[PDB]
Structures are given as structure tokens and as C-alpha cells.
Structure 1
Amino acid sequence: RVSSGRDLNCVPEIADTLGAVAKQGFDFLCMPVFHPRFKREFIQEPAKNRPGPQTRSDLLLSGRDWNTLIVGKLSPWIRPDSKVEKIRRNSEAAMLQELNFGAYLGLPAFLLPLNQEDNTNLARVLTNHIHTGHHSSMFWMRVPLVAPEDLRDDIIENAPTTHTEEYSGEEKTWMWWHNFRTLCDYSKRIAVALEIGADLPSNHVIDRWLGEPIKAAILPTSIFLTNKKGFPVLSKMHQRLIFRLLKLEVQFIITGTNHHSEKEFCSYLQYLEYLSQNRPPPNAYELFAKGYEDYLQSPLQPLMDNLESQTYEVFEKDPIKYSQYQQAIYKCLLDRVPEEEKDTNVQVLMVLGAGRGPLVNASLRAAKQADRRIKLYAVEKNPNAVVTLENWQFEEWGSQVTVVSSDMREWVAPEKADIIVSELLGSFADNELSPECLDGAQHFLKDDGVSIPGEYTSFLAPISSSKLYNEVRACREKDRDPEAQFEMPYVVRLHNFHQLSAPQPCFTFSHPNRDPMIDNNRYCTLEFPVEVNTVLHGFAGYFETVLYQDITLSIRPETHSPGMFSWFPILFPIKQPITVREGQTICVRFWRCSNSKKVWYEWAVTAPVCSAIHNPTGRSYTIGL
């Protein structure tokens, strides 16, 4: 199903008009709150004293209908940024008036136009309306993909259309929006209703709108081609956009007179629902992360915190991860136990942070798979989970498994270990402090001992999403730094966003760590070639680990382990968004810092411009030891 609406600048009888669009199958109506041609005077007599009513009564519809079925429209005559004083003054009062009426009616959204570069006074007037009471009603800015001046036919002799190359010029429509939105201090209520024309721009220009808050897409009747059978259809490339737009889950709005007069306006809408259902279906991942898109969560800390039962439940809900683990251990055993030594030699396998023992069962299956003999210690500091292990051990595992209720850093092991197995990784790999935990337990691994996982590596990529930037901004909480939100990472299924460059590795860690002096503190400098004009809003985090040899796990999209939903990506926000221009390199600096007590990340952008160093001294965010 597609949420779809009808835009009209002509409504004679609101009752009949709304009826029609319902029968035609439209979920909502975009229509004028005052007659589009009904200009109003506020300052100069006598026309200021024009007898009312000034527009049609709220009584003509149910409040419910006003709240759900109607999207308001600013009158086209209202031009707040006019060079003529008297027009700006009347346009100011008219905009307020019309905007206040939408509020009075409880309209769910109100359409405003960005058809020129200077909508400064328009931004200023709306801003006031927004700061006049606190309401949720959305404002859709009608901004065309392609400016109307760059769409005009080359039919003026003396004023010919410029066909010269215009990279930045062909993106002038986004800067219109960017500036308006910026003046209005990135208010959650101001979103984009993107208008599409017959001539699409370059993927380039379409690429500008990736992270932008697009609540609606407006499709004129004009852009629709005619199928053999006279049916409204669309270009393949027009269609690529619609599929793109469907992933962003925008509402669709049909504007203009029905040029396919044979068939009803359900003809146009039929096409969209046709394309909607004809989209390729959602993979497990797409299905798994169905509610979680651009939904910010704090990263888990299973060291300083004791995880809840249902937390482990969803850890365990990913079979691919444990199949990978079984395989790594399967392979490792065969590499350490020759078939001559199978029955004479039994390996000492220690699961460190066993939770409810999914890695214990994997270790067991791996041994029955490798027909080799294994001894198991399940070491777990969470005593709530230690309960689950002991019930498993008693009822099932038997004396083959020795449950150890201890921190791996403290535990004095009876005997040293052939292999150590661990799940101590987060969306940025080292963020749960696997390095420190495994470094502490390292001493009770044999000199020839193996660590599964052997190695892990964080990756970072710059991103643009004004959506998520504002989500972080809104995470401000009383009785803390007002900007603490910006100085902390968030695990999130990034969705409405743009990767500005290729992921590069950040921090790498190897277990065991042979270094004479072991330091898990890291300073990394990274340089991101950017080939588009954009605005940096933060850095997306991913990781890869090597369980054993070729067996690996990745949330890095390029190498992403397929069907594995065990980790969403991490996000490092920045306080102030940074404009980046095509060709420019983004230089970021990441530090992993440590106490006796705590570990944290500090980050800075040095190019194209310097940022503040974020999370200095872990003031805003730290990870417990």
C-alpha cells in the first residue's frame, strides 16, 4: 500500500470535492484554506474594511477530517520577500492569518513554496508562527528538483537557455531548502515535499536529497507518459526515483488536471500501487530492522551493566553468527588435534562471557563435528545469566562444562587454556572493551593458545543526514551539558542518510596481544575523498572480526556478513554540521582513551574545517571497566 494524496488549487464545494478524491482512492487532500485568488488588504482603506466572511466555515467538515484528511496550502499571491514594501507587509499578515487558520482547524500539515532563492522573510514569519504555541502540525516546503528557470523552453530569441556545464547551479534548489531550513534552526516541523518534473536532473542533484527530511513527493500529471493502451505510465528512470522514494517511505501527491481523461484518476494512483507491490521484497535484514530505521539507541555495555534475559534472547536470535563460531572452532580443533591424537588429546576451551551458553552449544557442536575431545569452562560475571548456565550445565551439559561465576580479569584458572572463545564485540568492535577483558584473561592461555576471535577492526565513514542530526539534537536532557547528545555514539539502523565516502579502518586489535608493553589506547587520522557537495552531520561506524583464518563477521556494508542482524551500525554525531564541497577531503581524528576506571572515544574534524574535540575526558560519554 502507498499513502497518496490529491493536490488541487480549485475547491468549489469542499463536501463534494473531498467525496470525489475518496471515491478516486486518495488518503488526503491538499487544498487552499482561503480562495487562491482572494487577495486581502490589511493597512490601506478602504479594502482593509472588506466585509467578511474571509473564508469558508470549519463547520463544513468533521474535526477528525480536518485533523486527518486535509493538508492546507498558502495562497499563491502571498509573497513575503517582495521588493515592494506594501506587498511584503500584506503578505506577512496574510501568511500569519492563513497559517493561524490551519492551526485553528488542527490540520496535520500545511504546504509552503520554495520557488526562489530569497525566502528569508518567509522563514522568519513561519519561525514566529512555530514559536507561537507548541504544536506538532508539519510544514511541507514545496521545492522542485529542477528550478523553473532551468526548466523553461529555449523559445526566447534574445534570452537563450544556458547549455554550458553548471554543477553547483544544477543543485540551486537544495541550497534554497538548506538555507530556509537553517534560518528556521532545523525545526522538526519543517520537512520537504519534493516536486518532480518531466526532465530529471543528474543522479548527482537527486543525490543531494538523500539525508533530507522528505515527508512527501509531488508528481504532476504532465510527467506521465501514455502506454499503448492509453494508460498513464512513467520513464524507467522516473520509476528508479519512485522505488528510491518508497524506501524512504514518503507520501505521494498528484497535482494537475487529469490528461488521461478516458480512465479515472485512480489510473495514476493504480500505477504507483502497481510499482509499490512490484518493488523487490524485503530481505530478512530489511524485515528484521522494520521499526528501527533511523531509531537512535545507546550502545549496550555488558561489562559495567548486567544484561537482561530478553537482551541475550535477541543476541541468540541470529543463527548465522553461531554457525560462523561453530565453524571457526571446528577448523581450529582439527588444526590442533591430529587424527592419531583424537582420543588421547582433549582440548581446554574457555568461553569468556558465556551469557546463556549459545557459544557453549556451538563449542559442543563443533567438537561432535570435528570428532575431537574438549573440556569447557563457561566464565560469566552476570550472575543472573550464571543462573541460566548452571540450570543448562546440571540438566544437559553435565560435568563436561565447569561454570565459573567470575570476571575473566580476576579468575585464577585451575589450568591454562588451548582456546578462548568470546562474544565481547559491539557495533564499533572494541566499544564493549573486549581488548581489556581478553588482555586480563590472556595470562591463562597456553603459549601456543588460540583466541577466537583472533582480530577485530573498527571502520568509519563520513555521512550526511539532517534527519539524524536533528534526532540527536532533540536528545537533550535536563541536568546535563546541553550538547552531551552530540558527544556520544548511538547504535542505529541508518536509513535516511548518505555515505559521503568509502569506509576506512579506524582501530584494530589482535588476541593474544604479544606486545612487550600492551597499550589499547589509539590515535587514528583519517582522510575521506568526497566527490559531491554535501553537509557532514557525523561518522557511521562498522566493524569486521576474524574468528579463525577465513571465518569472519562484518557489518561493513561492502563485506557485510549476509543475513546477520546481530549488530546495527554506530553513529558518532558532530555538534555543528560542516558544508563539504566536491573534491574536498574530510579529515577526522579518533582517539580511544583509558583510565583505571573507564575507556572512551574523543573525535575531531580537522578538514575541510576544524571542529571541537568531542567527548573531552569522557565528560559526556564513558565505558565502564
Structure 2
Amino acid sequence: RVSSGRDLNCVPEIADTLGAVAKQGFDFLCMPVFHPRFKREFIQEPAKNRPGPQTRSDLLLSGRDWNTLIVGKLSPWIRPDSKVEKIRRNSEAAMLQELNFGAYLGLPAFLLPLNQEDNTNLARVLTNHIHTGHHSSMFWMRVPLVAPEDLRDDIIENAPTTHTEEYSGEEKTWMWWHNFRTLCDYSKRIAVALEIGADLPSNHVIDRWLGEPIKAAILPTSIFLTNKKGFPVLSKMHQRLIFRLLKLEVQFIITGTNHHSEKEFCSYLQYLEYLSQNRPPPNAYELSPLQPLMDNLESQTYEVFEKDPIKYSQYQQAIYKCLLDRVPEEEKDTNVQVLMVLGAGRGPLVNASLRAAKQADRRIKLYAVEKNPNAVVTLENWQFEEWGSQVTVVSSDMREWVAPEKADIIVSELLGSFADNELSPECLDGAQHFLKDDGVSIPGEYTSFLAPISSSKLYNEVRACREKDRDPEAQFEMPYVVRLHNFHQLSAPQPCFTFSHPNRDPMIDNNRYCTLEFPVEVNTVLHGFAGYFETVLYQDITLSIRPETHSPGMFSWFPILFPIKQPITVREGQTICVRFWRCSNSKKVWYEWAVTAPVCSAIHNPTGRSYTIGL
């Protein structure tokens, strides 16, 4: 369903008005805490000594009603950035008065307007209110998609509207939000209440709001069209924006009087509910945003990583093809192919290898190697109750285990967000000694990819991960497991590093260094880099989490995020240059990264001070 509210700048009877909007079907109400025309004086006599009350009582609604049904509104006369010092000083005290009253009522959100370029003093008064007593209160900034100056009708004779293309000028409203958000030091309590106009701007303007903290979407009655029945509807372009906003789970707000007088306000809400009940169908991937790389791995953590039928059906086909290619029809019963499952886990690859041998109709001798003794319990119980003498469970590290015979095929996997998955090159290098001279490794190739991303929401989430007894900026020097739905990609992903198994080099060095140049054709703000990977199990049988070559049905593998301490402003035509290192000692493996264009950033995670994966 649609979580929606009604916006009203006129409330004569607070009890009767709330009953009218609840009857219409609205969940909450955007109303003013003080009368919009009631201009108060605070310095000049005798208007400052005006007899009270200054507004209506808090007793008129119950505590639960103020906490869940009423969203505050700042009075329109309050202009803290006015050219007149008297209006400026009076608006400062009135803003504090209205913000403190909103906190006193315990309102879940408070609406403040961004209708001009300069809101520096409105930013100071709000930043001061937030730093005066901790609260769960939210602040929604009313920002339009198109400024009213660029929306006005061309009816002024000696002042015509600009018809020429102005790429940066069309994005000025985002600059109003960004400058205000920057001044307030990226407060977790300041969000966007995006106001949609009659005519939508170009795609790049709407795309600039991707990754921004949009918590509300304001829709005026003026933007609604009249269908061939007399009911309020929306254009196909306006409908496209509603589908995008519904996926972000924003609270839709209805503003303005009923222009469809022959109908009612309930029909405007019925059309939004009609859009959600008939929105595009979701996929298996669609059915906190960031989680760090897991190293504990419990029974349920192994279970959710095993919830990938597409991954093991590919592994089955990869082993099935390798068996027929290694042993012909004449050696069907006389030749036994020794298979070694390195990192056996709870037996998902083992069962897939057994299903492949029955499919290929070839003889196999299985060895199930696993370091985790908790997972070995599941393997040894599986072997005794189902597998038998065919599968030999080994409770040892693949790098230190002494095998009784050389292997024909070695099978390994990366499961979920396990931190030790990054050690795959070193783990397979210490296991290839007990592999035959003509032996095959499944997978045989791994190729990683990097892409520049923009997400002001994810940047503030990493920023909130500050911990005591460690560097206050350590959170930006470590990778995170994030969903593709959150961030906005700035350029096509490019190859970062490749690993081939078995490694034939006489002097194997798993250390890497690449310089990637990404062309950016939009005005944006860089917050970090997303990492994807492609794997070649056997010949044409592959698995990929890269957005272009993504395997349909995959759910266990999520992209990795490498954030940056300070976000970098990127212009149209500019190039993002990233420097990435994969570093490895004789004990630890870590990642290092830095930005060299358009502007320079500090090298992240030097010597792995914030993050390392122990071998």
C-alpha cells in the first residue's frame, strides 16, 4: 500500500480537520504549528508585548496523535535570509520558537522550505536546534524539481522566459539542497520532501536526485490531468516517476484545493493506490543497507549462502562437462576421476559433484576438505547417513593438508559475503601442489571489476559507523556488502584484476595494481566505488554479478563497496581516475585505493590499518 499524507495551510478546527482527512483515507497531516499569517514581533515595542496565547494548546490532541499523525510546518513569513536585518533577526527567533514547539509536541517530522539560493542563516538556526538536546525528530526540506522562476508562464512583456539550453541552470534546485545539506554537516535528521511540478524537467535533473535522502514526495492537485470520465489522473511521464519513488518507499503528500469539484480528495489518493497495485512486476533478486564482510559464519549464515539453486546447477554442469572431456566412453568403468572439494562447507558442492558424476555416468573418488570444524560435523554426518566410502571428509586447511594422492579436478567456491573469499588466489596456490600436471581447477578464472558510484544516503550510513577505541575515519577505509538498488553507477565497470587457476608462473605474485579511467557524462558527486566479479567455472559455463553479464536468479552474491573519506564533485565530460591495489603479506591480504582525478584523495587503508583478511 501507499503511506500517504494531506498538506493543509488552513486548519480552523484541529479536531474536525483531522477527522475530515482520516475519512478521506490519509495516514498523516502536514499542518502549521502557528497561524501562517500571525506575524510575531520579538524586539520592537509595543508589538513584542502582544497578549497571548501565541498558538493553540497541546491538550487538543493526544500524545499518540502528535507523535504519529501530525507533521509540522514552518510559517511562510519566516525568512532568516531576508535582505532586511529586522525581518532576519525576527525570523531567527520565530524559527527557534516553531522548532522548539514542534519538538515539545513530539512531532515525527517538520517541514522547512528551500525556495531560494541563499539559505545559510536558515541552515545555522536549524543546525543550532539539532545541537541543542538530542531528539528522534526529522526535518523535511521542501525542494521543488523545477524552481518557480523556471516554471512561470511566459506572460511578462519586457521579461521573456529563457528558451536556450542551460544544463547546470536546470539543476539549480539540487544545488539549493546540496549547499544546505553541506552547511548542516550531513545531519542524519535532515531529509528531502521533493515537490513535483506541472511539467517535469530533463532526465539528467531527475537523475541528480538519485542516492539523495528523499523521505517524502509532494504532489499538487494542479499537476493532475482530467480523464474522459472527470476523475484525476497523471501523465505517462509523471507515472514513471511515481514507480521510481514507490521503490524508494517515500511518503506521498497531496497539496492544494480540489480542482475536480464534481469528485473529491479521496480520488487523488485512489489513483496513487491504483499505481502501486498495478506497478511493474518484481524479480527473485527484488524478493541496514550496508553490512561488513562476515568472518564468524554460523549454521543460518551458511544456510542463506546455500540458498542459490542457479549457482550449484552451473557448478553441476561445469563438473559434468569436465568429466566427459577427461574420460571417454571406452574408459567409462575402468577410469576413476579423483575430485577434491576445497572449502566443502556443509556439503552443497559435494552433492553437486555427485549429481554431475551420475549425469556424466563416470567414476569419481571424492575428498571433502574444510577448515571449519563446525561445518565438518555437518559433512561427517552427511557422509555416514548418505554419501559413504565414496566421499572422504578431511578436517584440515587446504594450504597445509598432506593429500594421499594427486587430484584430477579441484572444486572451490566463494559463498555469500565471507571475508575469506578474498583469499581465494592464496588458498588455491597452496592447494595446487597436490593437483596433477594436467589437472583442472573449477573455477579456472576470476575477473574483478570496479565502477564509480554516487549515493549521498550510503555515504551518511558509512559516516554513522564511527566506533570508539579506533580511528574516527577507519569506517571509510573498509569494504561493505551493499544492494544494487541503493547506489547510482556513474560509468561502465572496467576490469580490475584477473586470477587464473592453476597458476603456471614460476614466481607467483598475487599482488595487484591498476589505474582505471572512467568517463563521466553527468554532473554528480562521487562517494565511492562498487566492485563486481565474473567467474569461469568451465569453458562456456559462467557466473557473474557484473550488471551487464549478471546471471539471472542469483541472490547469494552482492556487490562490494569501497567508500572515500571526502566526497568528490564530478562535472559533465570529466574523468574519474581510480588507483586500486590488492596487497598481500605472508600473513594478511588487504585492499588499498585512491582517487587522482578530477581531484586527489588520500590513499585509503595504508598497511591495512582499518581492514585486513588474515590468511
TM bucket, shorter chain: over 0.9
Q: Secondary structure of 1:5's partner?
A: strand
Q: Deviations over 1:151-188 (max 9, x none)?
A: 11111111111111100000000000000000000001
Q: Deviations over 1:565-604 (max 9, x none)?
A: 0111111010100000011010001100111110000000
Q: Secondary structure of 2:392's partner?
A: strand
Could you tell me whether the CA contact under 8 Å between 1:526 and 1:588 is conserved in 2?
yes
Distance 2:550 2:373 in 1: 33
Change (3 A) 1:475 1:277: same
**TM-superposed deviation, 1:428:** 10
Change (3 A) 1:591 1:574: same
Distance 1:606 1:213 in 2: 28
Distance 1:226 1:382 in 2: 65
Distance 1:299 1:113 in 2: 28
Show the counterpart of 1:281: 281
Change (3 A) 1:246 1:123: same
1:234 paired with 2:234, answer: yes
Q: Deviations over 1:353-407 (max 9, x none)?
A: 0001110000000000000010000000101111111111111111001111110
Change (3 A) 1:429 1:389: closer
Distance 1:493 1:596 in 2: 33
Q: Deviations over 1:438-466 (max 9, x none)?
A: 00001111111000000111111111111
**TM-superposed deviation, 1:429:** 10
**TM-superposed deviation, 1:282:** 2.1
Question: Which 10-residue stretch deviates more, 274-283 or 6-15?
Answer: 274-283
Q: Deviations over 1:94-138 (max 9, x none)?
A: 000000000000000000000000000000100000001011111
Could you tell me whether the CA contact under 8 Å between 1:427 and 1:569 is conserved in 2?
no
**TM-superposed deviation, 1:281:** 2.5
Could you tell me whether the CA contact under 8 Å between 1:112 and 1:139 is conserved in 2?
yes
Show the counterpart of 1:294: none
Change (3 A) 1:558 1:412: same
Q: Secondary structure of 1:399's partner?
A: coil
**TM-superposed deviation, 1:478:** 0.2
Could you tell me whether the CA contact under 8 Å between 1:212 and 1:496 is conserved in 2?
no
Distance 1:543 1:299 in 2: 20
Distance 2:104 2:578 in 1: 48
Structure 1 segments unaligned to the other structure (5+ residues): 288-297
Change (3 A) 1:384 1:431: closer
**TM-superposed deviation, 1:301:** 13
Could you tell me whether the CA contact under 8 Å between 2:27 and 2:69 is conserved in 1?
yes
Distance 2:487 2:66 in 1: 33
Distance 2:398 2:289 in 1: 22
Distance 2:18 2:560 in 1: 45
Could you tell me whether the CA contact under 8 Å between 1:303 and 1:624 is conserved in 2?
no
**TM-superposed deviation, 1:414:** 0.7
Distance 1:300 1:348 in 2: 41
Change (3 A) 1:338 1:331: same
Distance 2:320 2:75 in 1: 71
Change (3 A) 1:423 1:333: same
**TM-superposed deviation, 1:427:** 6.2
Structure 2 segments unaligned to the other structure (5+ residues): none
Question: Which 10-residue stretch deviates more, 103-112 or 261-270?
Answer: 261-270
Q: Deviations over 1:296-348 (max 9, x none)?
A: xx999999945211111112111111101000000110110101111111100
1:362 paired with 2:362, answer: no
Change (3 A) 1:161 1:255: same
Change (3 A) 1:178 1:544: same
Distance 2:306 2:484 in 1: 23
Change (3 A) 1:301 1:220: closer
Could you tell me whether the CA contact under 8 Å between 2:308 and 2:554 is conserved in 1?
yes
Could you tell me whether the CA contact under 8 Å between 1:593 and 1:602 is conserved in 2?
yes
Could you tell me whether the CA contact under 8 Å between 1:301 and 1:432 is conserved in 2?
no
Cα RMSD for the two superposed structures: 1.7
Could you tell me whether the CA contact under 8 Å between 2:416 and 2:558 is conserved in 1?
no
Change (3 A) 1:303 1:199: closer
Show the counterpart of 1:422: 412
Could you tell me whether the CA contact under 8 Å between 1:299 and 1:489 is conserved in 2?
no
Distance 2:458 2:344 in 1: 35
Show the counterpart of 1:474: 464
Identity of aligned residues (%): 100
Distance 1:62 1:388 in 2: 56
Distance 2:175 2:85 in 1: 26
Change (3 A) 1:371 1:346: same
Question: Which 10-residue stretch deviates more, 89-98 or 486-495?
Answer: 486-495
Could you tell me whether the CA contact under 8 Å between 1:431 and 1:623 is conserved in 2?
no
Change (3 A) 1:347 1:429: farther
Q: Secondary structure of 1:285's partner?
A: coil
Number of equivalent positions: 615
Could you tell me whether the CA contact under 8 Å between 1:429 and 1:456 is conserved in 2?
no
Distance 1:11 1:354 in 2: 67
Change (3 A) 1:621 1:401: same
Change (3 A) 1:584 1:362: same
Change (3 A) 1:241 1:13: same
Could you tell me whether the CA contact under 8 Å between 2:338 and 2:364 is conserved in 1?
yes
Could you tell me whether the CA contact under 8 Å between 1:320 and 1:563 is conserved in 2?
yes
Of 403, 409, 415, 2:393 maps to 403
Could you tell me whether the CA contact under 8 Å between 1:306 and 1:382 is conserved in 2?
no
Q: Secondary structure of 2:165's partner?
A: coil
Distance 1:446 1:399 in 2: 23
Q: What stretches of structure 1 move > 3 A for 4+ residues in a row?
A: 298-306, 424-431
Could you tell me whether the CA contact under 8 Å between 2:293 and 2:419 is conserved in 1?
no
> Structure 2 length normalisation: TM-score?
0.98
Question: Which 10-residue stretch deviates more, 57-66 or 309-318?
Answer: 309-318
1:101 paired with 2:101, answer: yes
**TM-superposed deviation, 1:430:** 8.4
Q: Secondary structure of 1:150's partner?
A: helix
Alignment of 1:573-612 (within 5 A): 573-612=563-602
1:508 paired with 2:507, answer: no
Q: Deviations over 1:507-529 (max 9, x none)?
A: 11110010111000000110111
> Structure 1 length normalisation: TM-score?
0.97
Change (3 A) 1:109 1:118: same
Show the counterpart of 1:266: 266
Could you tell me whether the CA contact under 8 Å between 2:533 and 2:546 is conserved in 1?
yes
Distance 2:273 2:84 in 1: 46
Show the counterpart of 1:223: 223
**TM-superposed deviation, 1:241:** 0.3
